[PDB]
Amino acid sequence: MDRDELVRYLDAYLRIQDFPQDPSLNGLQVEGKRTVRKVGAAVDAGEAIFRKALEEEVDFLIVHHGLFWGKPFPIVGHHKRRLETLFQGGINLYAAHLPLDAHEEVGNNFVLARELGLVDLTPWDVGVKGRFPQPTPLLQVADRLGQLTGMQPLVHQGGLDHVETVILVSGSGTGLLPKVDADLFVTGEPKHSVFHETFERGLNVIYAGHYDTETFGVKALAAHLEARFGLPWVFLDHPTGL
Amino acid sequence: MDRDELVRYLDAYLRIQDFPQDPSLNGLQVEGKRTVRKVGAAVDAGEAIFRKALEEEVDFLIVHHGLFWGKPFPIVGHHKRRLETLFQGGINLYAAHLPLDAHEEVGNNFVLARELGLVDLTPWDVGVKGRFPQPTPLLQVADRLGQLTGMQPLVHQGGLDHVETVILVSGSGTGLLPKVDADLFVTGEPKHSVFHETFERGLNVIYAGHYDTETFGVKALAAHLEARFGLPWVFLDHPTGL
Amino acid sequence: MDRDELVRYLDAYLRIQDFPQDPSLNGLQVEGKRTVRKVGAAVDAGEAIFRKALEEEVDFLIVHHGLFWGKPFPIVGHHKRRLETLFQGGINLYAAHLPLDAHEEVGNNFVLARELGLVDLTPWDVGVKGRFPQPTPLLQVADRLGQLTGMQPLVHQGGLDHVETVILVSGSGTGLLPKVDADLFVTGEPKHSVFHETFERGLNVIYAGHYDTETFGVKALAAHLEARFGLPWVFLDHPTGL
Amino acid sequence: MDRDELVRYLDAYLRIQDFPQDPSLNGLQVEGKRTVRKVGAAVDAGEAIFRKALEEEVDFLIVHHGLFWGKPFPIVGHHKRRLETLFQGGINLYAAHLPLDAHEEVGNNFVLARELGLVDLTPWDVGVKGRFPQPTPLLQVADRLGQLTGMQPLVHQGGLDHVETVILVSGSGTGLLPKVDADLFVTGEPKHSVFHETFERGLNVIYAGHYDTETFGVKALAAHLEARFGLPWVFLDHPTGL
Amino acid sequence: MDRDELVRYLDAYLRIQDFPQDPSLNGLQVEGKRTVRKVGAAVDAGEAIFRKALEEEVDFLIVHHGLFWGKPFPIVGHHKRRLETLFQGGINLYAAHLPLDAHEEVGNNFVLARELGLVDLTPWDVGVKGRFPQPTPLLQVADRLGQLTGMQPLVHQGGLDHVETVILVSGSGTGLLPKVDADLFVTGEPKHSVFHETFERGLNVIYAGHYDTETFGVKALAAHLEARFGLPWVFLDHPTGL
Amino acid sequence: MDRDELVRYLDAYLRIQDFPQDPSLNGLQVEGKRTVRKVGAAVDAGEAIFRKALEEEVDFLIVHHGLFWGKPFPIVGHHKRRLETLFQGGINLYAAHLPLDAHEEVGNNFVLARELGLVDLTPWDVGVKGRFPQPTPLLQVADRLGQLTGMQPLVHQGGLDHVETVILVSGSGTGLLPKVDADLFVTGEPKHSVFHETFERGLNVIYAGHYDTETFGVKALAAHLEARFGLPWVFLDHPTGL
C-alpha cells in the first residue's frame, strides 16, 4: 500500500484535527518506505520496540505514545539511536495519542468497554466514553479485567460493593477524578495524590495498568486496516509493569 | 506554645519565602486554638488523618500535602467535613510543601539521604545530590531503603550493578529524569511514561513509594520542635501504598 | 425543599454555564443543611450578613458577591469566623455574580430598568441590557433613582439635559464607559479615572451606589423561588455607603 | 529651559527606569516647544487642564495621570482635540505615574505623610510606612487630612480610636488592603468591595479622595524645578470630587 | 460625503470585525474634516505620503500600513510631525491591513490574481486566495509580474519549469511557506531564513516586492468608492525598493 | 579530537548558558562520530551544506542557524533527508545562534566591526557599538563593507554624509531600529516596514546581506579551534543572495 494514502486515511479515520490541544504530534512522526507491506502496532515508542519492528520487518509502526510532545530535543544519545533503527529499517512511525484514546470504533476506551460488558455506551471526556450499566454486578469486574489483562488490578473501594454505572479512561485518568460521577471508575495508573479523595468521596476505582489498558487501541486500529486493506500486522509487546 | 509564635518560627525556619512558585499554600492553612500543647505530624491532609489528630488531642497538625493548591474549590462534600473536623478539635493546619522537601536539617531529601548513608550532600533541585564513600551494590541500596520504609522498593536497573553518585528526590520526582546525571536516582512514585527513557539512557532508578519517601521531613520537623520548644508530638500514620 | 434540587434549579435558571469567565465561583459556595425551609437574600457575603442570617434562621443564603474569586485564601482570621457562622447555622451559601447581573427576568439590571420606566429593553454587555427610550424625560430620572433607592445619586451631565436612550449596568460599570452609546448611562460606583472622559465625550452618567444598585437581583431571585416553591424569604440589609 | 535637558533631568531624578511595569508611559508623552519658560502642574491630563495650560502660557505640563496606558487608541473625538490643544500652545506633556507616587523627596506619599506629621518613614509598595511620635486620635488625623485638602475624609473605623503606625498610599490604593498591617491606612478612593474586609479585620482606614491625595507630588516636583532651574510654575486645578 | 458614513461603509464593506487578531488598528486611525471631497490611496503611512496628500488636497487618506500596531508610542519626533501634517490638512487617516489583504473584491491578492490570469479563484489563508490554474504556462509569469509592476521579480525555482496551481500572498508571506501546496507561490518580500527550505522542498517562489504587491488593494478600494459615491481619488506613490 | 570534550569547550567558551531565551537550541544538535579530525564552518544548516560537509570529510559541523527552534516538526521530507546525510557521514551538528552573534572574540559583530575599522567597541544588544577614530564618509564605509563581502551594500542615507558612532547588528537586525542612537547602523537584511522610519528619524543605515554579515563568526570560531586544538577546517560556502 502507498504510505501516503495510509497516512491520509488514518488522519481522516481518527480525525486528528479534532484534538488540536494534544501536546503529542499526532500523525506520521517519522517517514520510512513509500510502499507498506506490513503493519506493526505497539503502545510505546522506544528503542526496544523499534528493534522488534525491525526484526518482524514492520514497514508501518503505529504507537499510542510517540516521540514528540512539543518539546524539541536534540538528536543525541538515545534519541539518535531510535532514529537510526527506524531509518535502517525503512520503518514509518505513525503516532496516535488522544484521538486513538477517544475513537468510538477502535479507541482504547470504547474497545475495552465492550470487551468488558458495558452497554448503553456514550462518550465521557476525551479519550473516553465511560458511564453505562451491566446491570448490577459485584465489584469483581476486577476479575474480568485481570483475565482480560493477565494481571490482577488494584482496586480502591470507597463506595458500593456492587456497581452499575462505569466510566472508563485508560492511561492516566486520575486527573479526571473530581468529575467522575459513576459507581465505578476504570483507569490505568494510580496516583498517591488522589488516594484520600477517592475514599472520602466514596468512589470505586480500579487501576488496571497504564500499559495494559492502552494496549487495546493500537491492536484494534491494526486489525481495522487489515480488514479494509488486507495489510497483515503484528503486535510488538513491551510490558512495563506500570 | 503560643500559636502565632510557633507559626512565625516555622515560616522563618522553613524559609517559606524562598519558595514563591510552590503551588501549595505554605504556612498556616487553617487556624485553630491559640495555645498549642501537642503537635501532630503527617504526610497528607485528609479526613482520616484529621480524625486521628482529633482523637489524640493534636493542637497543631503539620502536613506535607495541604488542602490548598492555588485553585479555590467550594466548601462542600468531603471539603466541608474536613474543615468541620479541624474546627471541632480546634486544630491548626500548617502545611509545608517544597520548603520541607528541600530543608537541609529536616527536609525529606537531606534526612533520607543521610539515613541512607550518602555523603558530600548538596542541593539538587528540591532534592539532594551526594555519594557513597565507596562503590555500593545497587541491591544493597535497595535493601537499606526497604529496611527504612518496611517495603521492598521497585528497581529499574538500566546501568551497572554498582553505584556511587546518587540523586535523591522524594515524592513524584520522575519529572527531573532528563536532568539526572548520577549512577543512581531514588524517588517515590514510578511513571510508565519514563520507563523506556530510564533504560535507554542506562539510568539506575529506585522507586520507594510517594508516601514512604515523604514521611521523613514531617517527622524530623516535629522532632525538631520538641527539641526546641518541648512540644510533645505524634505521627499520624495512614500508609497509602503508593 | 431539598437543597440539591434548589442548587440544580438555580444553576439552570441562571444558566451559570454561560459565564465561564467570571472570576467568582458561581453556584453553591458553602454547603449547609440538606432541608431548606427559609431563603435569605443579601448583596454581600460577610460576617455581619452571616450573623443576621443566623438570627433570622436562614437556611439558604443567596448573595451577589460571594467568598471566592479564583484567589485561594487560608481559612484564617476573618475567613475562619465567617465559616464558623455558616457552619453553626447549617446555612447554605449560594453565590451568583455576573449571571445574576445579566439575567433578563430577575437580573439586577433588567429588574431595575423596569422599576425605572425603560421600555424596548434589550441586553447590552454582560450584567445588562441598557439602551431603551421613555420617551424624552429630563435628567430627573435622578429622582426616581433616589426615591427608588432612598439616596440621592451622583450625576455627571456632560451631554443633554433630557435623555431618551438609557444604558444600565449596576455595580462598577465605568470600565464600560468607552462603549456607552446612549443619552444616559446608569451604574453604581464612580471612578476618578473616568471623570474627564465622561464630560469631554458629552456623556450623561448617574452613579446610584454599588450597593444600592446590586440590591435588585437577590431580591427578585428570592421572590421568584417563593412563587415557584413557596419558600419564604427575608432580605438581609448591610448598607455600605458605596 | 532647554526642553530635552529638562526631560533627561526628570527621567533620571524620577528614576523612571526603576519602574518598568508601570502601564503609564512615563516621560515626555507629547513633544512641544524647545525653549521652556513656564512649567505647569496638574493631577490629570485632559482637555480642561490643557486649555488652562494654554491660557496661562504653560510650556511644559507635568501630569500624574497621562494619556498613554499601553493600549493605543485612535486619534478621534476628544483624543484629537486633546493633542490639537497641546500643539496649539506648543505644550510639552510630561507624565509621571508610579515614579511620582513613590519619590522620596517629591512623591505623593512621602510628601503627604510628612505634612501629616508621620515620622520614621520607609517605602511601602509605592506608598510609605511610618508612625506618629505618640498614639494619636483617629479623628484628629481625619481633621489634619481635612485641613490639608479642604475636604473632610471618609473614615472607616474598624479598630481603636487611637492609632500610631500608618500606611499611606494615595490614589486608588484599596488593592493593597490585604497586605496592610498598621494601626491606620490612608488612601484616596474607597471601594464598596473592601468594605466588609476593612471592619472584619479591624482595620482603620481613611479615604481622602483620589484627586485630593494626588496633588502633592505634582506640586512638589514643579516647586522643585523652580528651586533647581528658576522655572516659574502654576498649578492647574480641576477638582474631580473623587 | 459625510466622513462618518464613509467610515461606517468601509468598516462594513471590508468587514474588519472578522479580523480581530490583526495587531494594526483597522478603521479610522486619525480623524480629519467631516466633509470628504477627495480620496487618497497609498501603501504606507508616513510623513512623505502625508505631505503629498496635503499637496493633492486629499481629505480621506486610505493606507494598507497604518500608524498603530498595539504598541503605544509617545507623540514625539517623527510621530508628532506626521500628526501635524494630517491635522494641518484636515486629512482623515483610514487604515486597512489584513482585511484589505483578504478582501475578495478589492483585496490585494484577489485583485492581483485576476490581473495575472489565475482562474478558479478560492481563498487561501488570510490576506489571500492563492491556488488556481492557467492552465500550464512556463515560469515566465515572472514577466507578467515585471510588466505589471515595472520591476523584474526575484524567482527561486526549486520545482517545475512550468506551473499550473498558484498561491498568492502579498507582502511578507514567507512565514506561510510550510503550508504552500501549489506549483508556484507568489509573495512580495524574500527572507534569508527560508532560502534552503524553498529549494529542498522543490518550491517555486516569486518575490515581487512588498511595496509593489500591496499596491493593488488601496487602488481598487479607492476606485470602488468612486464608482459608488462619485468621490474622486488620487494615488500617492512612495516606492521603497523592498 | 574527542567529540564530547570539544562540545564542553564550545558550550563554556560560547557561554551558551548566558543566553537562555534563544529560541535556537544551542550546542550539539545532532550527534555524530566520537573522534573528530576535521571541523566544518557554515552559516546555515541545510541539505546543500550537509552534502558539502560529507564530500569533504567534515567530522564536526559548526553552524549559525541550526535545525531546532523550540517548535518540534516531524522527520519527513527534507527534514529526514537532512538527518540521513548527517548520519551517513557521522557528522556532529553544533549550532550557536545568539552566543555567536555576541561573542567578543569570535562573534559576528565584534569580528566584523573590528575588520570594519571601528574602535572603542562595547556590547549593544547582541551586536556592538563603537566608533571610527574620525568622521568617516558614509560611502567609504559602504565600500569597505563591499570589499569585505564581495557585494555592494544597500545604503539608506537618512542623515549626514559623514558618520562616526556606529551600531552593528548582523543578520535581520531591523527590529532594534527604534533603539538605535548612532550616526550609522549596519545590519544584514532590510525591511520594507522600517523604510519610512529610517528616513523620518534621519538615520543612516547600511544593509549588507543576512548571509554576508553572518559568515564572520562561524569562520572566526573554526579558526579559533584550529589555533587551540590543531583541528583543520573548511568553510562550506553557499551564498543565499539575501
From TrEMBL, chains A, B, C, D, E, F:
GO terms for cellular component: cytoplasm. Pfam families: DUF34_NIF3. A divalent metal cation 1 binds at H65, D101, H210, E214. It comes from the Bacteria. One of its GO terms (molecular function) is metal ion binding. Signal peptide: none annotated. Belongs to the GTP cyclohydrolase I type 2/NIF3 family. This is GTP cyclohydrolase 1 type 2 homolog. It comes from Thermus thermophilus (strain ATCC 27634 / DSM 579 / HB8). The lineage of its organism: Bacteria, Thermotogati, Deinococcota, Deinococci, Thermales.
